[model samples]
Structure formats: structure tokens, C-alpha cells
Target: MSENAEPVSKLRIRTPSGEFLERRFLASNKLQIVFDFVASKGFPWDEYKLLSTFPRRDVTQLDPNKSLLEVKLFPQETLFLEAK
Candidate 1:
């Protein structure tokens, strides 16, 4: 993938009855492609922001405590969305 292009994945939410409700974004990015993909799912975009000051590294080293659930810029400078 190009430095500006990446895949955005959305997680399906489970209802109280264990049925699939809808999709939600665990995270996105500062780029347009990221926003478009997640926004298309009707997720909350106004509540998310692109972190611009994080360090760049491999996602493998990220701590669970630091994972972003909705949308976040990883230490590796990529978009990630943690599963609920």
C-alpha cells in the first residue's frame, strides 16, 4: 500500500440477543480514504480525531492499554481500530 492509502476495517456490533446490530469503526486515520470508508458505515466521525504526535513503529509493539478502540493513529503511523 502507498504511504497515503490503507485498508479500513469495521467491526460488527452484537446486540443483547447476540444478533448483529450494525458496524462500527474501531479506528481510522488523518487521510480521506480512511474517513470515507468509516463514514460510509454511518459511524460517529465527529467524535474521532487523528492523533498527529504519536511515534512511528510497528503495531506489534503497541500495548493493549494504549490501543484506540474507535479511531487512532498507531505508533507506526498507520490507522487502527480495536475490536470491542
Candidate 2:
């Protein structure tokens, strides 16, 4: 494998407003990227928290400096936008 090659992960996000957003990103990308994408969709970071289910975890508390792969959110995951 190339040293600079990065694996991509497809993600599905469900917004509080019942909207679903599908996107892809490198596994090395930070969680902040996901946060920013949610913000771009009309939900501000201060007003909402990102979550993962099937065990129910809060992703917003993750370190912004950490990559999605580091947090084990890769290979695909379903995230939800919840109001704070």
C-alpha cells in the first residue's frame, strides 16, 4: 500500500429535523470535520450534540484532535444530531 494512501469511510447522519445526510471522508479525518458538516447543514455545534447508537454513545465529547478511525467510528457508522 502507498504510504500516503488513506482509507475512506461512508457515514450516515440523521438530523433532529428528520433529515438524513450521507457523506464520505478519510478515516484519518478528525471528528471536527463531521461536526463542521453538520453545522453546514444548518445545525450549529453549540446547539447540538452528535451521537452514535447500538450502544448509545456521545461523540461530541471526543477530542477534536482525534481522528474518526482513532475513535473507532470508521468502516461506517450512523450518527444523530440531538439538541442540547
Candidate 3:
């Protein structure tokens, strides 16, 4: 890895339909990349919101322009997809 590069993270995403998607991405990647991954899985960006479990946070409310590392969602995390 590059000296300044953040390590990759493994994330688990659950959909409203109870489907689970496993993904791996760099911590420095933007949240929009995750959004696009969900969209690519058939969920539309306009119709669903992304959220994190545990403390229960809304991922969609985060700045799409910010990197995962900048947002402090590093290492590993679980997220869910909700209807709009």
C-alpha cells in the first residue's frame, strides 16, 4: 500500500428486502461509491436511504463528497438500505 493510502474495509450492507451484500473498499473511498454499489445492486438512489446499525446513523445524510476515512467509517461497518 502507498504510504498515505488507508487500508481497505469490509462492509456488510442489508437491504429492506432482507438481502445482504458484502463489499470491500478502501477507507479513502467516497460514500458515493457505496451508494453506487447499492444502485448497481438494483436499488435506486432516489428511492432508498443508507443507514448504519449499532448507534443507528443515516449514511445518506453524510456528505457524498467526503471519503469514508474522512467520515471515520474505517476498518469495518454494517449498513442497511431503507425505503424513502
Q: lDDT per prediction? A: 0.36, 0.84, 0.83
Runs in model 3 with CA error above 4 Å? 1-6
Cα lDDT for residue 55, model 3? 83
Q: State the lDDT of candidate 3 residue by residue for 12-78, as single tens digits.
A: 9898989899998878778889878889998767888888876888888889788888876777888
List runs of model 1 lying over 4 Å from the truth. Answer: 1-6, 24-26, 29-84
TM-score, cand. 1 vs. native: 0.25
lDDT leader:
2
**Runs in model 2 lying further than 4 Å from the true structure:** 1-5
Give one digit per residue, the lDDT tens place, for model 1 in 1-84: 225544434433332334442333333433344444445544334543322234533232334334243235432333333222
Q: Candidate 1 — which pairs collide?
A: 26-70, 26-81, 27-70, 27-71, 27-81, 57-76
lDDT of 1 at 1: 22
Give me the candidate number with maximum TM-score.
Answer: 2
Clash count for each candidate, listed in order shown: 6, 0, 0
RMSD of each: 11.2, 2.7, 2.5
